[PDB]
Every structure is written in C-alpha cells, then in structure tokens.
C-alpha cells in the first residue's frame, strides 16, 4: 500500500505544515502536524478542558463506532518550547492520504498549554519519530509510520515540504519526479529517539565548503535551523547589521538586506537554502528588524534540522532494518 498526502503552511511564515487527517468511522477529518521529532499522535477531543479549546476541530471517540478506550492509559508530553499536552488514550482507524492503519494509537488531551490552545490552525501532532519516545503509560504504543511499515510497498516516508506553498508526505514509495539530481543517503543513529545523522559541513553564501562534522535531527516539527554556535555566527557575520539580540531571543537582521544562501553536506552532496527561506519577517508588527531562520542550538543540547532546511529538499525517511536518510535537491 501508499499514501499521499498534501501538507498546507498554517500560516505566511511556515511556521509549521498541516496535514488532514481522517480519524474514525465515520471518519473525522482533522488537521495534524507531521512531527518527525516526536512519536506521539495527539488530538484535541470532546475530552479536552473546554476553556483551552479554542478554534480547533475537536476529535470525538463517542461517535466513532471504531474508537476504543485502552483501559487505564494515560499520556503526557512536554516539547522543546515549553508547550505541554496530556490525557488518555483511544486506539482507532486513521487514515493518511489514502493509507489506513487500523488500531491507531490515537491520544486524547484531557489538558493542552496556553501555546496549542492559541493555535487555531493546529487539531493535534502526529509523531514520525522512533516509538521508542512514544509517552503513553503503562505500555508505549506505536507510531502510525511503525504501524504501517510491513503494509508499505517500501518502508519509507518522504516529506517534501514547500517554500510559502503546499507540499506532499508520501508513505510508501519514492516519487522519482519530486526532485532533482540523486537521493543521497545518509547513516541514521536511532540512539535518542529521532532521526539523527551527521552533516559533513556548511558553506555560507558563496564562500567555500568547510568540512565538519555536525550531528543533528531532521525535524519536519521545528520551524528553524539550529546549528552550533560558531556556524551560526558565520553566517550572520555575511549580513550587514545582523546582530543576537537576547531582547528578542536571537538573531535579527534589517529587513531590508538580502540574505546569503546557507548549504549543508550531506556526504558528498550539498543542499542549499535560498537566503529568502531564511527571512522569518518583522521581530513584530510594523518593525524594520526582521527574525532570523537560522539560530544558534548551544542550550537545547541537540542540533536540528528543521522546516528551514528542510523545504530546500527532498527528504526520505528510510524506515528499513537499519534506517537511513534521503536528500535530494528539489
């Protein structure tokens, strides 16, 4: 079996993608964010405190005639933001553009931060990583991508994110006429939970290639680039006026530059983000200083590769015995 589906920007500054979802029978359609740096499929429901709820599709287990309560489970995770989420846990058919997992660990929230709350656009994640960081008690339950593997014509997902515009998950195969070039393949470490590989370096704008090595995470569910600090500060040192602001909480630049590119190795290959996907908009309305896309991840403790480098590629998800990663430009 495949699945297709479009995932749609929530908002002028792709600050995450959406994607429908279809949850029980009848199915309910709600829009989730594909996260492959977490391993939990959660959803706002008819269980969620009414008071942080606010917008959002809400899933209802009681009229779906596939729901089933997992006796005495419960569930809670906390993200690298602060943002937090808890409840119980339902299992029932889930659907993804057209691939259908039946017994779906679906996780209700009895309880959401202030964050998922004021996100109207956004009816819960879904976790893509390894289900080894799944959250739900006594027993961890699978991811839908876990679920679905030995129903896949091939063991992959691929997430082919667009720049201010729609882009394609697909579960199952590899869509030949989605990019450019060859797929390079990567070593993939599943030690932490995520999809970790190591970066072979960087350049900034024109400048020469540097070679070194930068372990990281590729995270369709963080919206920047976080990289280490001396690399950070290569590339903003090429922006005239850039500067950290500890005000704002990182690099800004005038609005009016033009930013230089930024490239990654994937071994041999190379994948280059336009310096426009790196432009974050005003630090708020009306100001002429601007937030940048690509940050310094000295504190958070883990490089991540996210939505920013991410949508300058095509990437495969390689979910085989030993799992690798696919870039590809696009």
Do not use: M
């Not at 070194?212 to 976080?226: N, P």
């Amino acid at each position: 079996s495949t699945g297709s589906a479009t995932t749609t920007p929530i908002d002028s500054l792709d600050d995450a993608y959406i994607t429908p979802v279809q949850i029980g029978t009848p199915a309910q359609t709600l829009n989730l964010d594909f996260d492959t740096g977490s391993s939990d499929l959660w959803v706002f429901s008819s269980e969620t405190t009414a008071s942080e709820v606010d917008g959002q599709t809400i899933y209802t287990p009681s009229k779906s005639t596939t729901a089933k309560l997992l006796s005495g489970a419960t569930w809670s995770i906390s993200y690298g933001d602060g943002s937090s989420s808890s409840g119980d846990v339902y299992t029932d058919t889930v659907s993804v553009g057209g691939l259908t997992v039946t017994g779906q660990a679906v996780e209700s929230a009895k309880k959401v931060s202030s964050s998922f709350t004021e996100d109207s656009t956004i009816d819960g994640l879904l976790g893509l990583a390894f289900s080894t960081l799944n959250t739900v008690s006594p027993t961890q339950q699978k991811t839908f991508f876990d679920n679905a593997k030995a129903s896949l014509d091939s063991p992959v997902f691929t997430a082919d994110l667009g720049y201010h515009a729609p882009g394609t998950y697909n579960f199952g195969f590899i869509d030949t006429t989605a990019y450019t070039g060859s797929i390079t393949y990567t070593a993939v470490s599943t030690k932490q939970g995520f999809w970790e590989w190591t970066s072979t370096g960087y350049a900034v704008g024109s400048g020469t290639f540097k070679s070194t090595s930068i372990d990281g995470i590729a995270d369709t569910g963080t919206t920047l680039l976080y990289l280490p600090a001396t690399v950070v500060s290569a590339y903003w040192a090429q922006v005239s006026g850039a500067k950290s602001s500890s005000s704002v909480g990182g690099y800004v630049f005038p609005c009016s530059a033009t930013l230089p590119s930024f490239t990654f190795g994937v071994g041999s290959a190379r994948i280059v983000i336009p310096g426009d996907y790196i432009d974050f908009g005003p630090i708020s309305t009306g100001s002429s200083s601007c937030f940048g896309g690509i940050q310094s991840s000295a504190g958070i403790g883990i490089n991540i590769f996210g939505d920013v480098a991410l949508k300058a590629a095509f990437v495969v998800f390689n979910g085989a015995t030993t799992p690798t990663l696919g870039f590809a430009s696009k």
